[PDB]
Design a protein around this ligand. Structure first.
Ligand SMILES: C[C@H](OC(=O)c1ccc(CN)cc1)c1cccc2c(-c3ccc(CS(C)(=O)=O)c(Cl)c3)c(C(=O)O)[nH]c12
Ligand SMILES: [Zn+2]
Ligand SMILES: [Zn+2]
Length: 232
């Protein structure tokens, strides 16, 4: 159909790519957790004759499959990866990346939390992101720390060439009916963090959530709405 691929269409272990814009893809994979199956997204951004990866494919074997799919579909080497928070859907697979020549990065907050939780740990620390509203450049993207939301360390990623906003797990898809896995969330700060994203990226054309279908800037307001209803 060429439509964005949904949880039931992706067996656990296989990875899909979806072209978002020129030089921008999402990657989609599925994983089992606590007896249910979930999709999750990441991003790929062309960086000259190399690629920048945002987030793993949620597990070691999924991430190996991601690398194979990139080779098949794109054929440029992944040289760097950024993980946007410490959960396994973002860092699970960092060891696979590190053994495939990829330099792995995350904020110091993410690295601390990953280490404390027993999740895989990116090698390199991203300074300059410790206060909400902070932004830094990283190859063809901007990394932005909006404040605590889904997690206290969550980062969002903007692709200025294409006006693509990758919200990661701080942003939910339009069909969502709850705020996802909130165990490490700050439901009270989340709307404020989303407002910071809205103010900083008003020209975003595509908004990609951490899980589920991309859309437009409405994903941000919807996220605030579902989080408020969850807190309530
Ligand atoms: C890998 C990730 O682990 C955690 O978070 C986690 C938190 C604490 C512990 C305890 N040490 C362990 C693991 C995770 C595991 C399993 C599921 C998720 C979901 C998710 C996403 C969407 C929906 C549909 S929705 C919006 O309509 O609710 C749902 Cl149900 C869940 C999300 C997310 O929200 O980012 N992260 C998910
Ligand atoms: Zn998470
Ligand atoms: Zn998530």
């Amino acid at each position: 159909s060429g439509e964005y691929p949904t949880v039931n269409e992706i067996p656990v272990g296989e990875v899909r790519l979806y072209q978002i814009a020129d030089g921008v893809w999402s990657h989609i994979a599925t994983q089992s957790f606590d007896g249910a199956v979930y999709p999750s997204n990441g991003l790929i951004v062309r960086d000259g004759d190399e690629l920048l990866l945002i987030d793993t494919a949620w597990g070691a074997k999924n991430t190996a499959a991601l690398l194979a799919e990139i080779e098949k579909q794109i054929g440029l080497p992944v040289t760097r990866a950024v993980s946007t928070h410490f959960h396994d859907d973002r860092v699970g697979g960092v060891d696979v990346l590190r053994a495939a020549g990829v330099a792995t990065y995350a904020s110091p907050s993410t690295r601390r939390l990953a280490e404390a939780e027993g999740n895989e740990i990116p090698t390199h620390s991203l300074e300059g992101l410790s206060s909400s509203g902070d932004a830094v450049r990283f190859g063809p993207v901007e990394l932005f720390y909006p404040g605590a939301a889904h997690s206290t360390d969550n980062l969002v990623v903007y692709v200025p060439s294409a006006n693509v906003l990758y919200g990661g797990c701080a942003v939910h898809e339009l069909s969502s009916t709850s705020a996802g896995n909130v165990a490490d969330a700050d439901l009270a700060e989340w709307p404020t963090s989303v407002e910071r994203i809205q103010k900083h990226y008003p020209e975003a054309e595509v908004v990609i959530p951490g899980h589920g279908l991309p859309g437009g800037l409405d994903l941000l307001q919807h996220t605030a709405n579902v989080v408020k209803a969850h807190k309530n």
